[PDB]
Amino acid sequence: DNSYKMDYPEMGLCIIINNKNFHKSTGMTSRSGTDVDAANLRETFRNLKYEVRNKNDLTREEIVELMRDVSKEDHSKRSSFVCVLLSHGEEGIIFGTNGPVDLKKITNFFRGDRCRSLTGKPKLFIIQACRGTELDCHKIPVEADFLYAYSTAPGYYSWRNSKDGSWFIQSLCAMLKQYADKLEFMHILTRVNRKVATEFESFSFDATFHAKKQIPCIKSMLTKELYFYH
C-alpha cells in the first residue's frame, strides 16, 4: 500500500561512478579522497544487498553509454535502482573525465516510459558534486519515483576532504549503516542533513574558503515510503 515493494528477488543495481582523474585539457583538479567515498559506498550498499558495480574515471561518452546500457537491462526481478555520481559538477551537470554531462540526460534513460522494468520502482540518484560556486557562511508521470540525494544546496560548492572523503558521502554511509534496518529512507536522509550541517566546517588558509558550512538537499518525487528491509 504505502511502501514500495522491496522483496523482489534482488534489491537491484548500485552503479557507482567514481571520477578522480580528469583530462589535463579540462583544467579540472584531481578529486583526492574520492576513492575513500567509493569504497565506503561499495561496502554500505553491499550490506544492503545491492549488486554493486564500481566504475572509475569515465569520459562523458562512457557515462552516457553506461547509463543507456544499464537502462536497457531487464530489471524485472529487481526492487529498485541506485546510481551514485562522484565528480566535479555545476548546477544540473556532472563531469566526465573529458567534459560535462547533463544530469537530465542520465536520469531520462530511467523515465517510467523509457525503462519499463523499473516503472513504479524507486530510482535513486546520489550525487556528490558541486552545484555552483556559492559558499555557506501510462497513467503514472514519467518523472515519478525518482529521488535525488544531493550533497549540497542548489547553487553551492560541495566539500570533500582529501583524507576522510566527502562530508556528504561519509555521513550518508554512516547513517545507512546505523539506520537502514529501522528508518524510512527520507528519515535516514534527514539524519544525513543534520550530520553534515552540524559536524563539519571547512578549514582553509584562504579566508574565502575558510569556516564554511554545508547542507545537503533531498529532492523527492517518490510516491511511496522506502524501507531497505522487508
Binding site: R31, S32, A129, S151
Partner: peptide, 4 residues
C-alpha cells in the same frame, strides 16, 4: 578540505 577541498571543493568539487
Amino acid at each position: 578540505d577541498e571543493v568539487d
